């Protein structure tokens, strides 16, 4: 994968406006669980599923997140578009992060419309006590996450589309590109003439559109790309 890593580094080093697009592949290491109809039928199932999933996710940022943060610090990466709700990009130091599917940070009771910060629930949550509305007692505390069957936040989606339309490099990391409308974004960048890079553990059905394809672990690949970019810029 070294020649591919070098090709990706060359693209990024020459770019005027690079964008990174991430999915669950960088964070890890259906209807009833993660959809709005599922949540309305049984919000406890969503929360019990989330308790199981938390154990499978990285508790803190990994080297892929730090590499992406460093590329922004270097002035290369202008935006991170993410499908993830775990805020690991921000915790790694990324600033320009577009959260297509929101995040767990803020929550609302669907019955009485009370608002919450995640900090209010996290202790109980880690003990397996599901979020309940303290005001009215409801089981319907919904995080400001886009569940399947919900539209995306309009401002965020617009900004992400604008990034895709006006970038000259677009790097997908840890996404199979099967969730829409998020998955439209790499096609928009491709149509706009951006150089297309993909980094994944496995192939995707979208692989044919990419100029550079890297199969590997993002935590290994992304730091190597950064080091090569620094070498091309005489920073290492």
């Amino acid at each position: 994968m070294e020649d591919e890593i070098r090709k990706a580094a060359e693209i990024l080093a020459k770019s005027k406006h690079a964008v990174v697009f991430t999915g669950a592949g960088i964070s890890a290491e259906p209807e009833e669980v993660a959809s709005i109809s599922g949540f309305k039928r049984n919000p406890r199932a969503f929360w019990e599923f989330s308790m199981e999933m938390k154990d499978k996710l990285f508790a803190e940022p990994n080297p892929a997140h730090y590499a992406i943060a460093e590329l922004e610090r270097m002035g290369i990466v202008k935006a991170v578009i993410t499908q993830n709700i775990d805020m690991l990009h921000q915790r790694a130091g990324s600033r320009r992060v577009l959260e297509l599917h929101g995040s767990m940070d803020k929550l609302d009771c669907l019955d009485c419309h009370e608002t919450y910060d995640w900090s209010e629930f996290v202790e109980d949550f880690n003990k397996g006590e599901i979020p309940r509305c303290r005001k009215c007692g409801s089981y319907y505390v919904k995080p400001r996450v886009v569940l399947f069957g919900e539209p995306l936040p309009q401002r965020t989606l617009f900004e992400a589309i604008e990034e895709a339309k006006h970038c000259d490099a677009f790097m997908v990391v840890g996404s199979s590109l099967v969730v829409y409308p998020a998955a439209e974004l790499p096609y928009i960048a491709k149509k706009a003439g951006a150089k297309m890079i993909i980094v994944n553990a496995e192939p995707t059905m979208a692989d044919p559109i990419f100029d550079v394809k890297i199969i590997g672990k993002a935590g290994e690949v992304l730091p190597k790309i950064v080091e090569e970019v620094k070498r091309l810029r005489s920073e290492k």
Partner: peptide, 10 residues
């Protein structure tokens, strides 16, 4: 507005 968050094969 992009429709709903949804799964497709590609």
């Amino acid at each position: 507005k992009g429709g709903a968050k949804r799964h497709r094969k590609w």
